[PDB]
Amino acid sequence: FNFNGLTGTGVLTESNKKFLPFQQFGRDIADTTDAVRDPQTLEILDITPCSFGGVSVITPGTNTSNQVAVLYQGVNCTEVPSNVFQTRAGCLIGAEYVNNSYECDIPIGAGICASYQT
Amino acid sequence: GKIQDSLSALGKLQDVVNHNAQALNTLVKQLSSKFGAISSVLNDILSRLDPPEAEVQIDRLITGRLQSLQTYVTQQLIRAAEIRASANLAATKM
Amino acid sequence: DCTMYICGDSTECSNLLLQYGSFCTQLKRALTGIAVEQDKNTQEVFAQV
């Protein structure tokens, strides 16, 4: 998007902020633009960030297997692009979540683990 | 029973939260520092300036912000040694 | 994210950042090193049973 000079990237959504007739855009704490006013229609729109985070690969070692599962940290499983499991720590893909319990093997975070169980 | 009355103290736990929150608030604020650059935002320069000129500008904004990361990581290592020494004392008392 | 903190979205920047040697990767590694020890700290204090 570009709003009369403001160049950026993000998702545009209906806002609930109220600008003073002379203001064009707003910024949040830490001084980053978080709302704009459309020059043509004069409506206030929020700008939310395009999802991100690190990507890590979980591997048992090529001398055990070549399978792998991937956890996208605090990414919803609907905004990533079998076994898909949503946890409070992110989106876990490639492992099935069970209700049993074993000893930690490969820590995944927040109480969850994984291993090459048959 | 008197212990609850003395609570309803934990400043040592709030200080840990504060120190990290302050380093993360400072790390972000250091991006609005022209550091000696026409503009402090990247795209503007890299999009309101030729391709060989913007070089100098962005090169000026990279060294400054790379120094910011070195400061941040060095302090986290020094501060993590202090919480580690505290965790060793807590494990020993346990 | 070293590349997203410094450059930020821009792609003309990425080729310039690859100049500054591995100053970038070292940073990431140190930060993660502080990540493995913080979970071990907790296990040593509480997981004594």
Binding site: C104, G109, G111 | - | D1, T42, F46
Partner: peptide, 29 residues
């Protein structure tokens, strides 16, 4: 969340820590 900054979750939840503490209390008493 910020411009490339992220906070990772702990490996042990606070429920799991509570279970270590109750085990130490039940053993001792």
């Amino acid at each position: 969340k910020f411009n490339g900054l992220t906070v990772l979750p702990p490996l042990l939840t606070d429920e799991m820590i509570a279970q270590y503490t109750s085990a130490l209390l039940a053993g001792t008493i």
